[PDB]
């Protein structure tokens, strides 16, 4: 009976592949070849944030383009200000090995996690003034990879146990579980409408899930390596995926297929973090060559390079208004461009 | 300038001073990474070296210097992903029991994957062979032999530079030296002089393991200072 089920599964896969191929009447290049060139963009280090005692691995901008949060392997969370360049708060973490961090849209809670297999949510608007442990979400049999705040009451998290969990800040229990992947989920990316979210995993495929339904509707394939970074388009219909094969891809939620590929014979190092601008004209991507490349999201030509950091570009973030870009590497330096 | 901005700058200076003070305790501690298979006796090591949870931290101070050992037990067989987080550490203590002649190939493959890692090329690996008394008794009784798994055991002689402990049978010495040679053969692969392994023998009731770890870390720090302070 297993053989018949496997044959039916392979037949359905072949059918969906033929369906995705039949809808590919023309590529994006044949349509965008007529657009004006983007030229070159120069970015200079405006602010330099120093004070991290270990290697930086993750950052996140709050609801405003002024505050910033970052994580370091020391176990300390420092709130940075991009304007006056001072340290706001200093949250001491129990586990030093932190790999992800997020800022709530209300500006009241900050989540962190890592190899401790537990998520720590701290409150910044406490009456006592000192930051204390507010929520301790435990139950995951693996290290946390990425976490993002959706609302002021629920938060999704991803672990190495091939399961994603939508916890509730009030009760601290799993409200929705996602067990559709077959490899260690690496990165997450929410939608601007706060109803869907796309996750890139170790199975070289990205899957889109819903907050209420909790079922994967589309499965994108084409990567030949481990997908490590992912970020959705500002409109909410496309998303970029980067792997260690030095080839980034741009998938579409409506077309259900790959649209554009960014690669270069000079770059052989893997991608670590990918993000989009406010309008989505340019695509930022951090590589392991100690640099960060900004290409054109439609023309795939090298628009600019950034060689401010001497170590591996670990984390990259873009503000909500696109006024400044934050780049954090393992050299304990968090640089700001434009 | 407004008063709030000056107070914020003063608080930032205080936080920077606190970070500078924490630098003294963060730089003067050595972070070790304990690795091993499921059958390895690392549990006895961590419970006897006290001189759903994730990372396991053990802080022990010996010879006036402290060590923070980190152990991962709740993770699956996936290792090539999170191991990049364990870079820049002081040492990697890989404990493996040699008494299990059946799963020796798995431990050998694990050690080869750890040594030939792209990110772990700079960090050395301290090799420990635990559970020596059980292996010695099993090879003295003649229940399970080595050549039934590795055909190179018969084509191996006792090295001349061997310095055995007085009061042991030559058979267990030949066996442990063959195991050490087999581990060195895969340890020396792709060495390039950037890192060297430290094969050492240990037991469960053995208590001076801390001294051996301290000496190995001393050698590692000496090599690091020779590579850094322009003397090598």
């Amino acid at each position: 009976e297993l053989d018949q089920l496997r044959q039916e599964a392979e037949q359905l896969k072949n059918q969906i592949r033929d369906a995705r191929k039949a809808c590919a009447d023309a590529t994006l290049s044949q349509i965008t070849n007529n657009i004006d060139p983007v030229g070159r963009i120069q970015m200079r280090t405006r602010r330099t944030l120093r004070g991290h005692l270990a290697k930086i691995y993750a950052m996140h901008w709050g609801t405003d383009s002024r505050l910033l949060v970052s994580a370091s392997q020391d176990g300390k969370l420092i709130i940075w200000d991009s304007y006056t360049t001072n340290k706001v708060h200093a949250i001491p973490l129990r586990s030093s090995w932190v790999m992800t961090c997020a800022y709530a849209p209300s500006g009241n809670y900050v989540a962190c996690g890592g190899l401790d297999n537990i998520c720590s949510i701290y409150n910044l608007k406490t009456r006592e003034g000192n930051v204390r442990v507010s929520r301790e979400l435990a139950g995951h049999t693996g290290y946390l990879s990425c976490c993002r705040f959706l609302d002021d009451n629920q938060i999704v998290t991803s672990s190495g146990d091939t399961t994603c969990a939508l916890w509730d800040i009030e009760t601290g229990q799993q409200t929705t579980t996602f067990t559709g992947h077959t490899g260690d989920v690496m990165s997450l990316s929410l939608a601007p409408d706060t109803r869907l979210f796309v996750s890139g995993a170790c199975d070289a495929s990205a899957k889109l899930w819903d907050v209420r339904e909790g079922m994967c509707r589309q499965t994108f394939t084409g990567h030949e390596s481990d997908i490590n970074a992912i970020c959705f388009f500002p409109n909410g219909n496309a998303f970029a995926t980067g792997s260690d094969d030095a080839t980034c891809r741009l998938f579409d939620l409506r077309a259900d297929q790959e649209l554009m590929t960014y690669s270069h014979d000079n770059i052989i190092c893997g991608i670590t973090s990918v993000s989009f601008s406010k309008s989505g004209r340019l695509l930022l991507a951090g590589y392991d060559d100690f640099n960060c490349n900004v290409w054109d999201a439609l023309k795939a030509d090298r628009a600019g390079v950034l060689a401010g950091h001497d170590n591996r570009v670990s984390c990259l973030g873009v503000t909500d208004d696109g006024m400044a870009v934050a780049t954090g590497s393992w050299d304990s330096f968090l640089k700001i461009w434009n | 300038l407004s008063a709030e901005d000056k107070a914020a700058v003063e608080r930032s200076k205080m936080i920077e001073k606190q970070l500078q003070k924490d630098k003294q305790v963060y730089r003067r501690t050595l972070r070790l990474l304990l690795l091993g298979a499921d059958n390895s006796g690392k549990s006895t090591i961590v419970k006897q070296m006290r001189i759903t949870s994730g990372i396991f931290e053990t802080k022990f101070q010996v010879d006036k210097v402290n060590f923070h050992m980190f152990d991962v037990g709740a993770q699956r067989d996936e290792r090539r992903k999170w191991i990049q987080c364990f870079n820049d550490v002081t040492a990697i203590i890989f404990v493996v029991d040699s008494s299990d002649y059946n799963r020796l190939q798995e431990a050998l493959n694990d050690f080869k994957s750890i040594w030939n890692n792209r990110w772990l090329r700079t960090i050395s690996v301290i090799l420990f062979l635990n559970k020596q008394d059980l292996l010695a008794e099993k090879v003295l009784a003649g229940k399970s032999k080595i050549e039934d798994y590795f055909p190179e055991f018969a084509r191996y002689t006792t090295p001349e530079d061997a310095t055995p402990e007085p009061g042991e049978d030559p058979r267990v010495t030949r066996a442990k030296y063959f195991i050490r040679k087999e581990f060195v053969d895969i340890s020396t692969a792709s060495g390039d002089g950037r890192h060297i392994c430290y094969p050492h023998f240990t037991c469960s009731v053995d208590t001076e393991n801390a001294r051996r770890i301290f000496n190995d870390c001393k050698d590692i720090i000496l090599q690091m200072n020779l590579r850094e302070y322009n003397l090598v």
Partner: single-chain antibody, 230 residues
Framework: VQLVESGGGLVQPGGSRKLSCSAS????????MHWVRQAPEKGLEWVAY????????YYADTVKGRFTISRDDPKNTLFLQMTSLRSEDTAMYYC??????????????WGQGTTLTVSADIVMTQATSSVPVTPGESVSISCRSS???????????LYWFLQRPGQSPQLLIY??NLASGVPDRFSGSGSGTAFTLTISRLEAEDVGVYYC?????????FGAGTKLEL
């Protein structure tokens, strides 16, 4: 949080007195402290200010040199040494906490204070000293400043306090921005020289005196105070 002050009594002019203030329930080391004196049937006046770690300590122009203030972080205490007391030093002293960061609320909690009976600056003026108003209708209070409180960064430094009869003052507005625990009925709007505080519906618990404070320089100055008759 809780602030307990002690040290009041009958002191003759020219003596010395050590007022003590114990804090309990919050991080006293991270919060800067301020002293505010209030005379019987008069306005408020800033006495002194101390920062975290005693790195920034400042006094008012009328008490510079005579009075001093110190803090003890291990014991979590604040001490105020007042020497060579004058005949006008009879007043009630309040010790208040304030933290400075982006999105903070300085002067959020007001202590209980202790009474003591002995024997340029931006002066804040209020054209409406007493407005007898019926509960249920909106209240509009005006405030005029002699110097532009709008700094180059674009932030407006102005604080509103509501001192109820027989109770400690409460912070209503710290920056347009509403303070924590304060209902949304209060609002503030105006330019860099004129400000208006609007209350949509006044209730029986909203009775009190409204004081305004500027925070552009270190020597803070309070207003005359606007009281409302229930």
């Amino acid at each position: 949080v809780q602030l307990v002050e002690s040290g009041g009594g009958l002191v003759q002019p020219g003596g010395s007195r050590k007022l003590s203030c114990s804090a309990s329930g919050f991080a006293f080391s991270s919060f800067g402290m301020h002293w505010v004196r209030q005379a019987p049937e008069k306005g408020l006046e800033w006495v002194a200010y101390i920062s975290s770690g005693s790195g920034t300590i400042y006094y008012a122009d009328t008490v510079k040199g005579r009075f001093t203030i110190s803090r003890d972080d291990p014991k979590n205490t604040l001490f105020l040494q007042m020497t060579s007391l004058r005949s006008e030093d009879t007043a009630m002293y309040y010790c208040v906490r304030s933290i400075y960061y982006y999105g903070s609320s300085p002067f959020d909690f007001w202590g209980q204070g202790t009474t003591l009976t002995v024997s340029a600056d931006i002066v804040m003026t209020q054209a409406t000293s007493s407005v007898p108003v019926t509960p249920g209708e909106s209240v509009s209070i005006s405030c005029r400043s002699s110097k532009s409180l709008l700094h180059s960064n674009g932030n407006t430094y102005l604080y509103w306090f509501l001192q109820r009869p027989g109770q400690s003052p409460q912070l209503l507005i710290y920056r347009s921005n509403l303070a924590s625990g304060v209902p949304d009925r209060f609002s503030g709007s105006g330019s860099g020289t004129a400000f208006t505080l609007t209350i949509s519906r006044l209730e029986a618990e909203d009775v009190g005196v409204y004081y305004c404070m500027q925070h552009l320089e270190y020597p803070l100055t309070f207003g005359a105070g606007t009281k409302l008759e229930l």
